Protein backbone atom coordinates (compact mmCIF):
# COMPACT_ATOMS: atom_id res chain seq x y z
CA UNK A 1 0.00 0.00 0.00
CA UNK A 2 0.25 3.76 -0.70
CA UNK A 3 3.49 3.11 -2.60
CA UNK A 4 4.23 -0.27 -4.10
CA UNK A 5 6.51 -1.73 -6.73
CA UNK A 6 4.54 -3.28 -9.60
CA UNK A 7 5.64 -5.61 -12.41
CA UNK A 8 6.52 -4.54 -15.95
CA UNK A 9 4.04 -6.74 -17.79
CA UNK A 10 1.69 -5.70 -20.68
CA UNK A 11 -0.31 -3.39 -18.42
CA UNK A 12 2.78 -1.39 -17.40
CA UNK A 13 4.13 -1.47 -20.97
CA UNK A 14 0.84 0.06 -22.19
CA UNK A 15 1.14 2.74 -19.52
CA UNK A 16 4.50 3.50 -21.11
CA UNK A 17 2.95 3.56 -24.57
CA UNK A 18 0.32 6.00 -23.29
CA UNK A 19 3.01 8.24 -21.77
CA UNK A 20 4.94 8.37 -25.07
CA UNK A 21 1.78 8.97 -27.14
CA UNK A 22 0.85 11.86 -24.85
CA UNK A 23 4.37 13.26 -24.93
CA UNK A 24 4.38 13.04 -28.74
CA UNK A 25 1.32 15.35 -28.81
CA UNK A 26 3.18 17.88 -26.66
CA UNK A 27 6.33 17.68 -28.77
CA UNK A 28 8.81 18.70 -26.08
CA UNK A 29 11.11 15.83 -27.04
CA UNK A 30 10.40 15.67 -30.75
CA UNK A 31 9.00 12.49 -32.28
CA UNK A 32 9.58 9.59 -29.91
CA UNK A 33 9.19 5.92 -30.66
CA UNK A 34 8.19 3.84 -27.68
CA UNK A 35 10.72 1.14 -26.91
CA UNK A 36 9.79 -0.38 -23.55
CA UNK A 37 9.26 0.18 -19.83
CA UNK A 38 11.90 -1.22 -17.46
CA UNK A 39 12.05 -1.85 -13.72
CA UNK A 40 11.34 -0.44 -11.26
CA UNK A 41 7.81 0.85 -11.76
CA UNK A 42 6.08 2.38 -8.73
CA UNK A 43 2.37 2.67 -8.06
CA UNK A 44 1.00 5.20 -5.59
CA UNK A 45 -2.52 4.90 -4.22
CA UNK A 46 -4.38 8.20 -3.80
CA UNK A 47 -7.07 8.45 -1.12
CA UNK A 48 -10.10 10.63 -0.23
Amino acid sequence: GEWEIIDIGPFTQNLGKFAVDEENKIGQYGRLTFNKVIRPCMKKTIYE
Binding site: V20, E22, G30, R31, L32, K36, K44
Partner: protein
Protein backbone atom coordinates in the same frame (compact mmCIF):
# COMPACT_ATOMS: atom_id res chain seq x y z
CA UNK B 1 -9.95 5.24 3.25
CA UNK B 2 -11.44 5.82 -0.05
CA UNK B 3 -9.23 5.35 -3.15
CA UNK B 4 -9.59 8.34 -5.48
CA UNK B 5 -7.05 6.91 -7.96
CA UNK B 6 -3.43 5.97 -8.68
CA UNK B 7 -0.16 7.47 -9.87
CA UNK B 8 2.36 5.45 -11.84
CA UNK B 9 6.02 6.41 -11.93
CA UNK B 10 7.75 4.80 -14.89
CA UNK B 11 11.14 4.52 -16.54
CA UNK B 12 10.40 4.42 -20.24
CA UNK B 13 12.78 4.09 -23.18
CA UNK B 14 11.63 6.06 -26.19
CA UNK B 15 13.88 6.70 -29.20
CA UNK B 16 16.58 4.74 -27.32
CA UNK B 17 16.61 7.38 -24.57
CA UNK B 18 15.51 6.84 -20.97
CA UNK B 19 12.72 9.02 -19.60
CA UNK B 20 10.83 9.22 -16.33
CA UNK B 21 7.07 9.49 -16.79
CA UNK B 22 4.40 10.02 -14.12
CA UNK B 23 0.80 9.04 -14.96
CA UNK B 24 -2.39 9.59 -12.98
CA UNK B 25 -5.26 7.15 -13.34
CA UNK B 26 -8.77 7.52 -11.99
CA UNK B 27 -9.89 4.60 -9.83
CA UNK B 28 -13.34 4.07 -11.35
CA UNK B 29 -12.96 5.05 -15.00
CA UNK B 30 -9.22 4.37 -15.47
CA UNK B 31 -9.06 7.83 -17.02
CA UNK B 32 -5.37 8.55 -17.48
CA UNK B 33 -3.35 11.75 -17.64
CA UNK B 34 0.35 12.33 -18.31
CA UNK B 35 1.57 14.35 -15.31
CA UNK B 36 5.29 14.61 -16.05
CA UNK B 37 7.70 13.41 -18.70
CA UNK B 38 11.39 14.18 -18.23
CA UNK B 39 14.64 12.88 -19.62
CA UNK B 40 17.08 11.60 -20.50
CA UNK B 41 17.65 10.25 -16.99
CA UNK B 42 20.52 7.95 -15.92
CA UNK B 43 19.58 4.26 -15.77
CA UNK B 44 18.10 2.94 -12.48
Amino acid sequence: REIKGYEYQLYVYASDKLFRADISEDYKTRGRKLLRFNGPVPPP
